[PDB]
Amino acid sequence: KRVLIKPLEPLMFRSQGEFTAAQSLIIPRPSTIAGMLGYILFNKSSGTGDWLSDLTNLLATIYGTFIETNGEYLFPLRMGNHLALVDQQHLINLPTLLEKEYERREKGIYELFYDKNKLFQIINHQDRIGISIDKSTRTVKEHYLYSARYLAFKKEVNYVIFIDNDAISDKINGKIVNFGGENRIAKLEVDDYKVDTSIEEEYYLALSPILIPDEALDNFLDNISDYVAMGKVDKISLGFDIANTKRKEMLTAILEGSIVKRSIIDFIKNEIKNDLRYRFSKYEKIGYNTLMSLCKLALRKILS
RNA sequence: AUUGAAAGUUCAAAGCUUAGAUACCCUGGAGGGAAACCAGACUUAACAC
């Protein structure tokens, strides 16, 4: 039902190329969680060139990711190039604060992203530099000096997701998994948890990157205010497929932690023919289009 | 079936070099070899009567 991913050690979720150190994301993308879960549930017989088909077959609908620090729940929130983790008690008045007056707008939002921001109390950015040594000289092998900015945790942190199917939630319990990038470790634990679904509010929080079908890109973009009140829109890669050893895709997405307006739902519902409808239904199945209500902890997918 | 897999911050490297516990500094100042004390005490023996 509810799955807590507890990182045993600093993590690495590489983003935006490798070219001082390569930076890590705060919240891992849903493709990473889906890939770890499929890695657990894998069987070496269902192979197909469609990574997400073989991945949707291995599991069920996964709901987006947030932070459980110590009983508290933190949620991503971005204003544009400004990520933060806030407890939902500060998301309540947010829509009121959105089309509130100007100076009150900046007062409130910059009090949220700076003092109410619980990111740095939780997250440290730990640069790690490694090298490679040739086994006969015992001096650094030439050209092998790499760096990466890992995501260290000051206090114990969990990533929270919700999975619908309860059959896999038995062979997922207590598994030690290779969560993330350069061979780091996290533990999964499964617990029964109660979460509402599909509330009809006006302002939702993108818990996961809301994908855009690359057909309504111009449509969605040239009038952007109609769908997102605050957040970031960026072209993101969908990761790396283990089977064929390639990058996955690139799609414009509404980065997790954005504030979406109810209209976006109907918009996405009107711009998908059967083909890409099935495609993006799969995408949502593995966990991309997850919304939460600023009211309370109540999730819903956009299409499903 | 994870923007993945793989990769030792490793190698060489003397806390060394110059550098005086030295300079100035009286065992001196104060302090009576003094205080007390009789060169004195006393006659005895013998026989005669």
UniProtKB/TrEMBL annotation:
Transmembrane segments: none annotated. This is CRISPR-associated protein, Cmr3 family. It holds the Pfam family Cas_Cmr3. It comes from Saccharolobus islandicus (strain REY15A). CDD domains: Cmr3_III-B.
